[PDB]
Amino acid sequence: SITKTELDGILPLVARGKVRDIYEVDAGTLLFVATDRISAYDVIMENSIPEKGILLTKLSEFWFKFLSNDVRNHLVDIAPGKTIFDYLPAKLSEPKYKTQLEDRSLLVHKHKLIPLEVIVRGYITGSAWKEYVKTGTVHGLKQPQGLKESQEFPEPIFTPSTKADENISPAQAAELVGEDLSRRVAELAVKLYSKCKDYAKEKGIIIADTKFEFGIDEKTNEIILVDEVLTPDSSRFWNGASYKVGESQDSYDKQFLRDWLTANKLNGVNGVKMPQDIVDRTRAKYIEAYETLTGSKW
Ligand SMILES: Nc1ncnc2c1ncn2[C@@H]1O[C@H](COP(=O)(O)OP(=O)(O)OP(=O)(O)O)[C@@H](O)[C@H]1O
Ligand SMILES: Nc1ncnc2c1ncn2[C@@H]1O[C@H](COP(=O)(O)O)[C@@H](O)[C@H]1O
Ligand SMILES: [Mg+2]
Ligand SMILES: [Mg+2]
């Protein structure tokens, strides 16, 4: 398992997120390394879920391919017969480095990002449900009366956010990134979410909502799908089997972890080591999401 990548300065670091380490490959290219870290209640666990980052990378690769005729994406085309390692400095093929990178890394074009978190919600839950119960709105948008918890919205909706996160209205998104650009990302995001939500539902997973990020290629005026796509870290995954309108749903991937944290008053606490049984049960859910959605065997 890979918790924290250690590349000994071979590439400069651009960022470390909750789960991913981002390196600069060259002036036009980044390397996104998904680690096996996991977060709950906005804090990272001390220990890892082995191979989570491989599974999530491969799931993202599946979705990029699934959506290849719908949207351009940031992946660098790896030539036939080659691997990402052929596009990286030779030293990163040495075992001490290759073992940290293989199967969990994506080579991506640097794009100009549209600085907006493009959340699409298919189902009313989370902060959207809380706001709705209080004022009948979601990100300020008036909703029909009588929706029940976890109910499907009449149509999936664009509900933007700004990173720290702040739920904002569509009008505020247009202030931030321009009216026409906000309109284009909203329309595209809803199309992409709906297609993938329908596919996943037929496989038995409900993707209640998802967070996309987009770039813009200004030379072609094309919106580019970037960042994390339709993983349980970027989305709310629910078990289809146990879906019941009018109540909360278990987290597909994190409910075992959340239950254990809650039982021990560890929600939100730093430095927490998960017990082996929690690690194992959580890992098995990632493998099942990967196998069910991609049709591949792990
Ligand atoms: N193709 C792209 N080109 C340039 N930047 C990108 C591209 N795709 C995503 N990014 C940016 O790269 C970074 C991805 O890092 P990552 O999402 O793993 O961590 P984070 O956003 O800092 O924290 P978090 O774990 O909460 O997402 C983000 O700053 C994201 O907006
Ligand atoms: N941009 C990329 N970064 C890292 N791995 C990639 C990338 N593109 C494709 N791959 C991997 O290369 C293999 C062949 O994919 P493809 O190049 O699309 O034919 C797959 O197993 C992918 O996981
Ligand atoms: Mg991010
Ligand atoms: Mg992803």
From Swiss-Prot:
GO cellular component, one term: nucleus
Pathway(s) the chain acts in: Purine metabolism; IMP biosynthesis via de novo pathway; 5-amino-1-(5-phospho-D-ribosyl)imidazole-4-carboxamide from 5-amino-1-(5-phospho-D-ribosyl)imidazole-4-carboxylate: step 1/2
Gene Ontology terms, MF aspect: ATP binding; phosphoribosylaminoimidazolesuccinocarboxamide synthase activity
PROSITE patterns per the UniProt record, alphabetical: SAICAR_SYNTHETASE_1 (PS01057), SAICAR_SYNTHETASE_2 (PS01058)
EC numbers on record: 6.3.2.6
Record GO biological process: 'de novo' IMP biosynthetic process; purine nucleotide biosynthetic process
Top-level taxon: Eukaryota
Enzyme category, top tier: ligase
Entry keywords, A to Z: Acetylation, ATP-binding, Ligase, Nucleotide-binding, Purine biosynthesis
InterPro entries registered for this protein in UniProt: SAICAR_synt/ADE2_N, SAICAR_synth, SAICAR_synthetase_CS
Swiss-Prot/TrEMBL catalytic activity: 5-amino-1-(5-phospho-D-ribosyl)imidazole-4-carboxylate + L-aspartate + ATP = (2S)-2-[5-amino-1-(5-phospho-beta-D-ribosyl)imidazole-4-carboxamido]succinate + ADP + phosphate + 2 H(+)
N-acetylserine: modified positions: S1
Further facts: Present with 4280 molecules/cell in log phase SD medium.
Assembly and interaction partners: Monomer.
Annotated family: Belongs to the SAICAR synthetase family.
NCBIfam families cross-referenced by the UniProt entry: PRK13961.1 (NF010568), purC (TIGR00081)
Protein function: Catalyzes the reaction of 4-carboxy-5-aminoimidazole ribotide (CAIR) and aspartic acid with the formation of N-succinyl-5-amino-imidazole-4-carboxamide ribotide (SAICAR) in the purine biosynthesis pathway.
Name assigned to this protein: Phosphoribosylaminoimidazole-succinocarboxamide synthase
Source species of the chain: Saccharomyces cerevisiae (strain ATCC 204508 / S288c)
Classification lineage: Eukaryota, Fungi, Dikarya, Ascomycota, Saccharomycotina
